[PDB]
Each structure stands twice: as C-alpha cells, then as structure tokens.
Amino acid sequence: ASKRALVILAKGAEEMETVIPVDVMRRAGIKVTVAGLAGKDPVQCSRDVVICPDASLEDAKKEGPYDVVVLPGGNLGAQNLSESAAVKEILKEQENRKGLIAAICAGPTALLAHEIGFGSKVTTHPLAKDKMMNGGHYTYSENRVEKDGLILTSRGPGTSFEFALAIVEALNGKEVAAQVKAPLVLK
Amino acid sequence: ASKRALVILAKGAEEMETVIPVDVMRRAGIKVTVAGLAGKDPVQCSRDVVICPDASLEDAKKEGPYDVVVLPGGNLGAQNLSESAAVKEILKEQENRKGLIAAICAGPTALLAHEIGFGSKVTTHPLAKDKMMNGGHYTYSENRVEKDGLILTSRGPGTSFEFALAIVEALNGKEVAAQVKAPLVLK
Ligand SMILES: [Cu+]
C-alpha cells in the first residue's frame, strides 16, 4: 500500500515550497493530496502563482489518516495555517497517532501556534527564528533539514529538495529517495 | 521600466521548472506573464499539479515584446511546445530581435524543433541529449547552466534555481541576482 501525504495549501503559501515537495513525493510513488485550507477554489500563492487544489481540507481530512502532513511556508500562508482550527485538529491527531509532520520555512511557526512537538529540535527560515523561539519551546538548529523523530523541519525555498527527499526517505526508505534524487540533477 | 518575461505553460510541463523561475523572476521585480499554450484554462503539469495561467498565449503574445521567453521542461510539455506554430512564431521573433530565450530540461528540444539558435552551446537534461543533438545543430555542454549569448539552457529540476538566477542576472544584473539569492537559503 502506498503511503499517503496531506499538503495543506493556504493563501500566501510559498509556491516553490509547495510544488517541490508535491512533485518529489509523487515521483516517490506517494499518494499526495493537495488540500485547500479555504475550500476547493484556486489558491493565490505568495508570488502570485495560482494552484488548484485537489480537494478542500474539509473533504481531505475525512480521507485520513495520512503518513505525513506537510506545511509549506510563506509568511502569510503560515499565518493562515496558524490561525486555523481545522489545522490545529489535524496536527494534534497526527501527533497523537505518532505520524510524521513536515514543515518548511515559516511553516514551523504553525507548530508553535498549535502547540505541536514542544521540546523538539527545529529549524526555520532565518527570518522566522524569533517567532518560532518565542517562549523557548523548541531548540533551534541551523541544519538545512532537521529531523527530531516525527517532527521534520527545513529552512527555505533552497532547501525544498532536501526537505522533500527527507520526507521520501522517512516514508519509503533510503533506496527510493536515492532513486528519485538521481534524475533531478541536484548538487 | 521593469523587464518583462513570458513563461509558456503547456500540458505536461514540469511544475518545479515552471514555478521556480516564475517565483524567482518575480522576486527580482520582473513582470512575469504565465501564458497557457492551450488557452486560459488550468494546466495539468507532469506531476499533476494544476496551475492557472495568467493569460492565454494568444493574448499574451499581443502584449509583447518580452525581455525573455522561458520554456519549462517536462518531456510532454516540451513536445507540446515543439508542435506549436504559435511558439515557433514567438521564438523566431525573439531571436530576430536579439532577445533572450531561456529553456530548461527537455525545454531546449523545442529550440531544435523550431530551428532556433543553431550553432549554440547548449545543455539539456541528460535523457534529452540525444533528441537535442539529432543532426548536430548544437554543441553539447554538461554545465548545469549554459549561456551562449541569447540562448540560456539548463538541465533539470535541480538546476532550476541556478537557471532562474541566470535569467535574473541577464536582465537585472549581478547585484540584483545576489540580493534575490540570499533569502532563498541555497547551497
Ligand atoms: Cu487553477
């Protein structure tokens, strides 16, 4: 059975941080659902790329559980994620069931908002560090990708491939990740 | 006056190779038009990401000229570009006016189809080399990004940032490219 990923797409999401993980997980044979936070309508990303989600979050959440929940960054996207009761509920359930949560750039600040994974070692975009660290609930890392158990974080558009391949490795193993990586022409 | 980019988006385009350049050029203050080859409707990319273009190609082409025309890759997307009379006309006019043409991954094979830039040093995705080189009309390079005058080519999803920042450098200069690069958390 293929593994399953939920990507939560909100207005203001960073489009590279959304599309790179979706594409790479699909290359890995993961069944990815791109879910619109606000509904099934098209989502205007931070740099004005318009993406049509596969489903509303309302619907996608009924189709769980997922092997990973993925939170893209973008300052405004992450704020929308942080404000969402539905996201809170999804992340709490994912944490409760010992499932992976992956967040990139400003995305990890939604973990803080929802009180998820406290005590974890995390990274964020440099400009999001002070927000993530408010209260000292996490330990900060400058690694490009940080994985502390079931909390996987990364720093920015330029770490998106590394982030996505870490999700692939966690779900499908090192060999699948290496196989997916080669045709990408990385490094 | 800001510089202007035309990105031609066809069914089967590689979505990372489309979104990374769009986003990065917009960070550089370039006015980017995402134009749908087939019309204004949403475009299903190679890994099933659905992008809504800003305009049809039919319309966007009336709003020229552009400082760069950008061809994403994806094997099927590039085939659609290669088959298009409208693309032929756009590229011929761009070449005639000494404007930049940028193509990534299988994208450069549309240059061959349209007889554009013969004699140039080019790169492609490794799996697209034999198609690009049919007839020996170009000289092949393994550089991640190859720029021979007004023909700028690159290799794959993993070279998309480098490709996009080379377009930024060509249009807006080295300093703008460096400024845009830093917040991306590359390398
Ligand atoms: Cu759309």
Swiss-Prot record, chains A, B:
Functional summary from the UniProt entry: Multifunctional protein with controversial molecular function which plays an important role in cell protection against oxidative stress and cell death acting as oxidative stress sensor and redox-sensitive chaperone and protease. It is involved in neuroprotective mechanisms like the stabilization of NFE2L2 and PINK1 proteins, male fertility as a positive regulator of androgen signaling pathway as well as cell growth and transformation through, for instance, the modulation of NF-kappa-B signaling pathway.
Name of this protein: Parkinson disease protein 7
Mutagenesis or variant effect for residue 165 to P: In PARK7; strongly decreases enzymatic activity; reduces protein stability and leads to increased degradation; ubiquitinated by PRKN leading to its recognition by HDAC6 and targeting to aggresome where is degraded; interferes with homodimerization; abolishes interaction with PIAS2; reduced localization in lipid rafts; almost abolished detoxification activity on methylglyocal-adducted CoA
Cross-link (Glycyl lysine isopeptide (Lys-Gly) (interchain with G-Cter in SUMO)): 129
Cysteines paired by S-S bonds: none
Modified residues (N6-acetyllysine): 147
EC number: 3.1.2.-, 3.5.1.-, 3.5.1.124
Substitution effect: residue 103 to T: In PARK7; loss of protection against metal cytotoxicity; decreased detoxification activity on methylglyocal-adducted CoA
Main localization of the protein described in the UniProt heading: membrane
Entry's family note: Belongs to the peptidase C56 family.
Gene that produces this protein: PARK7
Keywords: Acetylation, Autophagy, Cell membrane, Chaperone, Copper, Cytoplasm, Disease variant, DNA damage, DNA repair, Endoplasmic reticulum, Fertilization, Hydrolase, Inflammatory response, Isopeptide bond, Lipoprotein, Membrane, Mitochondrion, Neurodegeneration, Nucleus, Oxidation, Palmitate, Parkinson disease, Parkinsonism, Phosphoprotein, Protease, RNA-binding, Stress response, Tumor suppressor, Ubl conjugation, Zymogen
Claim: Amino-acid biosynthesis is one of the keywords in the record: no
Catalytic residues in the record: 105 (nucleophile), 125
Effect of residue 105 to S: Loss of protein and nucleic acid deglycase activity. No effect on mitochondrial translocation. Reduced protease activity. No effect on protection against metal cytotoxicity. No effect on methylglyoxal-adducted glutathione or CoA
Presence of keyword Methyltransferase: no
Modified residue annotations for Phosphotyrosine: 66
Cysteine sulfinic acid (-SO2H) sites (modified residues): 105
PTM annotation: Sumoylated on Lys-129 by PIAS2 or PIAS4; which is enhanced after ultraviolet irradiation and essential for cell-growth promoting activity and transforming activity.
Main enzyme class: hydrolase
Residue numbers bearing the N-acetylalanine modification: 1
Lipidated residue numbers (S-palmitoyl cysteine): 45, 52, 105
Catalytic activity: N(omega)-(1-hydroxy-2-oxopropyl)-L-arginyl-[protein] + H2O = lactate + L-arginyl-[protein] + H(+); N(6)-(1-hydroxy-2-oxopropyl)-L-lysyl-[protein] + H2O = lactate + L-lysyl-[protein] + H(+); S-(1-hydroxy-2-oxopropyl)-L-cysteinyl-[protein] + H2O = lactate + L-cysteinyl-[protein] + H(+); N(omega)-(1-hydroxy-2-oxoethyl)-L-arginyl-[protein] + H2O = L-arginyl-[protein] + glycolate + H(+)
